[PDB]
Amino acid sequence: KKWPEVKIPARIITTSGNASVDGNPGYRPTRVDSNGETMGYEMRDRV
Amino acid sequence: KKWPEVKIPARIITTSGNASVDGNPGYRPTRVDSNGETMGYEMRDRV
Amino acid sequence: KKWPEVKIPARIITTSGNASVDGNPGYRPTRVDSNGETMGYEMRDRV
Amino acid sequence: DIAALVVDNGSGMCKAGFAGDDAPRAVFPSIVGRPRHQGVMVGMGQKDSYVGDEAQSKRGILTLKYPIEHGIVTNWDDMEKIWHHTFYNELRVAPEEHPVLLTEAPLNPKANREKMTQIMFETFNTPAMYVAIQAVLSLYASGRTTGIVMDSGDGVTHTVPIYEGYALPHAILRLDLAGRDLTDYLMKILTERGYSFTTTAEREIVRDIKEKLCYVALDFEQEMATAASSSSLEKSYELPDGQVITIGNERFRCPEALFQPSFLGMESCGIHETTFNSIMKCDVDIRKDLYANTVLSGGTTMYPGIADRMQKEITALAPSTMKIKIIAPPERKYSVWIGGSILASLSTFQQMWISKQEYDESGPSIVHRKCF
Amino acid sequence: DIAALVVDNGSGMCKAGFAGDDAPRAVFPSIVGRPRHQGVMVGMGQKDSYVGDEAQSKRGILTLKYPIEHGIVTNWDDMEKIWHHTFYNELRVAPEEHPVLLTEAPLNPKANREKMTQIMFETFNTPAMYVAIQAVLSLYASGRTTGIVMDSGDGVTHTVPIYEGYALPHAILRLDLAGRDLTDYLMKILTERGYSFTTTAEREIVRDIKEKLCYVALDFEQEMATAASSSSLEKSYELPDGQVITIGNERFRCPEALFQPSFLGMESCGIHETTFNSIMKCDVDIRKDLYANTVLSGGTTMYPGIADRMQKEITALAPSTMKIKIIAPPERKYSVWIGGSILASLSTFQQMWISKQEYDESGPSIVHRKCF
Amino acid sequence: DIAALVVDNGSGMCKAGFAGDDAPRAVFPSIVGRPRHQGVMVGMGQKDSYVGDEAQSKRGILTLKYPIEHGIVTNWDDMEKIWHHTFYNELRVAPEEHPVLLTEAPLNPKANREKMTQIMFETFNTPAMYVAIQAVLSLYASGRTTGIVMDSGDGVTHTVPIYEGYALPHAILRLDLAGRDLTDYLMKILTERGYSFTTTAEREIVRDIKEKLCYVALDFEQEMATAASSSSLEKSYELPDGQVITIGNERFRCPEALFQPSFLGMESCGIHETTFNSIMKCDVDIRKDLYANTVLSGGTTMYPGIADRMQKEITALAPSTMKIKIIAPPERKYSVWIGGSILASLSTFQQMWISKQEYDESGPSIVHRKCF
Numbered sequence A, B, C: 001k002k003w004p005e006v007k008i009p010a011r012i013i014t015t016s017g018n019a020s021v022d023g024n025p026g027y028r029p030t031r032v033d034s035n036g037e038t039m040g041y042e043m044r045d046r047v
Numbered sequence D, E, F: 001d002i003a004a005l006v007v008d009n010g011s012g013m014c015k016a017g018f019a020g021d022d023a024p025r026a027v028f029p030s031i032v033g034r035p036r037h038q039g040v041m042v043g044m045g046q047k048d049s050y051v052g053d054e055a056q057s058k059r060g061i062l063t064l065k066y067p068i069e070h071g072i073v074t075n076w077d078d079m080e081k082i083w084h085h086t087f088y089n090e091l092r093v094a095p096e097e098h099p100v101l102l103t104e105a106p107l108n109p110k111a112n113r114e115k116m117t118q119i120m121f122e123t124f125n126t127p128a129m130y131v132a133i134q135a136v137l138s139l140y141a142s143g144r145t146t147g148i149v150m151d152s153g154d155g156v157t158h159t160v161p162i163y164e165g166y167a168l169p170h171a172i173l174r175l176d177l178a179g180r181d182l183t184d185y186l187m188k189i190l191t192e193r194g195y196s197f198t199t200t201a202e203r204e205i206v207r208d209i210k211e212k213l214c215y216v217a218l219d220f221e222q223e224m225a226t227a228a229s230s231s232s233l234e235k236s237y238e239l240p241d242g243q244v245i246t247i248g249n250e251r252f253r254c255p256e257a258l259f260q261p262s263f264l265g266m267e268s269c270g271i272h273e274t275t276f277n278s279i280m281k282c283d284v285d286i287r288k289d290l291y292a293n294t295v296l297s298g299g300t301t302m303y304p305g306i307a308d309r310m311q312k313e314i315t316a317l318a319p320s321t322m323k324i325k326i327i328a329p330p331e332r333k334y335s336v337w338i339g340g341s342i343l344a345s346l347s348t349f350q351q352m353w354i355s356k357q358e359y360d361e362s363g364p365s366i367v368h369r370k371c372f
């Protein structure tokens, strides 16, 4: 059976921790925003 | 179909490189100028 | 007082960074080697 | 089902094999690379993407991407390429007939497990799947039911205290400081000598330099003073193009960021204090056994002299009557996979698998109540 | 001592003067040139070497070489000529009685700074000397104590975040992409129209073309589409010999390599993403003030529209709530020198000089524990 | 369509044939000549212009014009005569039913390629056409997908690095120094012995002298010292009128301008240093394979001993641990044409042609997004 989809949340860049925008030069850290407010970042593959 | 024409730009004589006026004794290095500005040279066949 | 000398290390040519052999046409990039190992390059003034 | 598979998908390395084996059959970096240059030759079979060892070999023309950062998948499209390579190209097996035991670091986002489950069941159609904690697996490889496991890989350092068959989740600690941060720090400190490694392939070059030449000093200030007389501690490393670099005090300043995270600008305490805090967060009666069974595991803990330093610092923190023992096997780099293969071949573990029937009737959220 | 000297001797331009002045007294390129042709006329007062503006004046018969490449001195023999010209011909002062404040890019080789100190103390006999970071001085000129300085000179681009006087060295980023690379790129792309500038004097000609006519596009694809109607964006430039060249879309392809380094074949992020990454590597509580006080400095940041483009790109990266403000003072070129003159004249700074007594005591290595 | 034509329209030589052939069917100089004297014999079949070998035969009463200079067409009215001769006289084919693959040097003006496309589609009505880089084709003839090609024709020298199918356009270097400059230099230096070749026919005579007797010294200073005791290195050459000249140290001072461009008054690096710079501008991990696969091609690289000199010079520049290998095929004069014939007959290449239907809907500018 198929279940709808697992939506991975947008990454929050803290001082130091789970996520960083500089980690992967091959990924572009695109801003994710809904309702006009920024929810975080996700690593698209362009740069 | 016929496309209008490829216009080759006037040659710019640097110290050494793509173009020179002394290369071909059979070509006269005529000056090309539009308005008052001398855009470069082109090799007519007279000398 | 006079201290002996500051020895400048040989430049390591990476993909893109601090040093390159093509940067200065006036400098010859002479190879620096000690023992059988190539330590890098330095810019002598001949070319 | 023929046999179970074990895949230790860490931040930087992928270790795949079969349950019951004593070593991973396939080991390759968790890298997806794509060409960053023009391409003029026709034919030649120029693929638009390379995975694992092939990407490493061709890295001179590729931009290398790690789909996992700090043990968390940042790009699932490339993670699916990693898994497809792992199954069809490395193991040469059909996932539809093999259970898959995956690994994850503790305190990960819950959606990371859910998408692992969803991909394993919907795109690979695995008959069964499980997601075990990396440090818990490492205790299996040590043959112990009691002790604290200090596990450091490419992206995550975590400590899990375990008494007799029982873990203590409140005492589990995690640092987002591991081999990748040390590689970047070595990249930044090699510029003091003029080396300017910047590209992703040069990141792998610096990682090789780190793995071959970095080591943990027993006394940092004394070793700095020794390296001040700079003739003995310096080592030469030949780059892939023939130029050789010289590395001196950076050799031990390179792993020192594990014990002094302030070198990276981090506020967190070192790995030695992380383990000590993890032990002190447990019950008083069990601390004595955790001190004598401090298991060291992970590829980052492979620096020479790291066990001696860990013993030196923990003896200074723990009470003097405790007998501190740092247990560092020769195979720390594979302890997680060995424990996963042991667990996946236990008879008592066969009912702990997430069955395909359970996924059908419960969805990806089954992983939260079934695994851990 | 009478007064302090400030020498912002960057990769491309030497900028010298006195502390307390609001503008450098002498500005000339960091160029040493030697004749490359046969001297036939006896007498004439010929010289085996020419320095600075004199080399530019007679660059036709001269081969021009930059002692500094990427903020690092590659030939100290010509650096001694440059500094001797600076002291005795441009400033017309004796270094024996003036403290000297020098400038250096961050993440430079440590031996480059050491030989700066050694030459200043043993060859020019300066009573005192100091080495300051270029981007740090630009914050002094702006009058701020909080903000991130994006300095783009001729060899180096670097960002330094500072919050209430405290710099964050772990967040400092460096890009080896600056005006020299853009000049070489413009030399490359001008060949599409048949212009074949090859020599070092023609490199200066192309640098003049770049400084006069190159500009930053607010939307690169829109500007390309507009330039497809090639009569509006085209500009004429007259060579020193009178021939007139025409430049078109190259005018904005010329600075675009700053934001798309892949134009140069490089893998690094653009200058906009470098600043954003530098801000994100800082603490969460201080990023809001770094966004509102992003300061531009250096000669390369003088392109028209670079402030608006940097503003546009950053607000698309930073969270929508932040008030992205780019500060681009008209004195962007001399921002480093003005900050150095301010710092050197501060009463609280007079005990931070490296004294000649300290140099006798400690040697060239004194500069590492005294300076940034 | 019957078959594809390949025309290697270099500065000095025209080499034409059919795809799939192992050698060009027609080879003749790219020369258009016109009479410079009074015709007095009525009839006689006199004509106002001669092309190719007929101009060479009649060059005494003719003024010889090269329509191409430095790989760039300077007079299209004569390049069209060259192409008309190539099609209707040398190959004896109708271009309206054969796709035509032309060659061009890199970093050429974009209008030169556009007029090639326009002339091929609007005057010769070719069903399809394509423009390929000369050095790229030379790698095809070598049976390689990895290596750097140093191509030296009559007008241009260029190096193109390729690694496993992908070229690095940022590392491509171009020198406007080739066989024509060497011929003019030999004309200049032969005046030291009183030989005063001045006309275009005498330029061809000096070109023949250069091709028969000029050679590359392994050690220029030692060869000069050997030629100082002039007995053995001198050779005799007979002019077409019966007078014989003697050439001495000029034989190896003749190609030395390739390695020391300062002999011509040029500032650029030698052909050995340009190749080394092109290799060093590539990625670190691919330089090792570029060193072992340095390919020489073009008519100018046909000097005896040029491969040994190139190996000697690059070995002194490259790091000592690299194995420098200079591949100089015996037929490297036609290496570009052989690669073009291989490419034009490849099955996968047949969908990369610029079709007549594509030119009709897009015009001459189609060539920029199709060929490179």
Ligand SMILES: Nc1ncnc2c1ncn2[C@@H]1O[C@H](COP(=O)(O)OP(=O)(O)NP(=O)(O)O)[C@@H](O)[C@H]1O
Pocket (backbone or CB within 6 Å): D008, D009, D010, D011, D012, D013, D014, D070, D071, D105, D134, D152, D153, D154, D155, D156, D157, D178, D179, D180, D183, D207, D210, D211, D212, D214, D298, D299, D300, D301, D302, D303, D333
């Ligand atoms: N001999 C060594 N010396 C030093 N560091 C090493 C050595 N071997 C491996 N490493 C480091 O450890 C990494 C691999 O360790 P590994 O345990 O495979 O990490 P992982 O499981 O991929 N990541 P994680 O999710 O953090 O466990 C390498 O990429 C290096 O950073």
Ligand SMILES: Nc1ncnc2c1ncn2[C@@H]1O[C@H](COP(=O)(O)OP(=O)(O)NP(=O)(O)O)[C@@H](O)[C@H]1O
Pocket (backbone or CB within 6 Å): E008, E009, E010, E011, E012, E013, E014, E070, E071, E105, E134, E152, E153, E154, E155, E156, E157, E178, E179, E180, E183, E207, E210, E211, E212, E297, E298, E299, E300, E301, E302, E303, E333
């Ligand atoms: N108007 C301008 N437009 C564009 N670029 C310019 C302009 N003026 C100067 N530049 C560039 O900036 C350079 C000089 O800037 P400057 O701030 O003096 O650099 P530097 O301090 O010498 N170098 P570094 O040490 O790497 O910071 C010139 O050589 C050009 O490359």
Ligand SMILES: Nc1ncnc2c1ncn2[C@@H]1O[C@H](COP(=O)(O)OP(=O)(O)NP(=O)(O)O)[C@@H](O)[C@H]1O
Pocket (backbone or CB within 6 Å): F008, F009, F010, F011, F012, F013, F014, F070, F071, F105, F134, F152, F153, F154, F155, F156, F157, F178, F179, F180, F183, F207, F210, F211, F212, F298, F299, F300, F301, F302, F303, F333
């Ligand atoms: N045996 C030889 N020895 C030395 N030089 C030679 C020899 N044969 C030919 N040449 C030179 O090489 C030229 C022809 O080389 P070729 O590869 O046909 O150049 P091209 O392709 O016409 N020019 P380009 O546009 O630079 O590729 C001659 O005109 C001479 O200058």
Ligand SMILES: [Mg+2]
Pocket (backbone or CB within 6 Å): D010, D134, D152, D153, D154, D298, D299, D336
């Ligand atoms: Mg691990």
Ligand SMILES: [Mg+2]
Pocket (backbone or CB within 6 Å): E010, E011, E134, E152, E153, E154, E298, E336
């Ligand atoms: Mg500067």
Ligand SMILES: [Mg+2]
Pocket (backbone or CB within 6 Å): F010, F011, F134, F152, F153, F154, F298, F299, F336
């Ligand atoms: Mg050719």
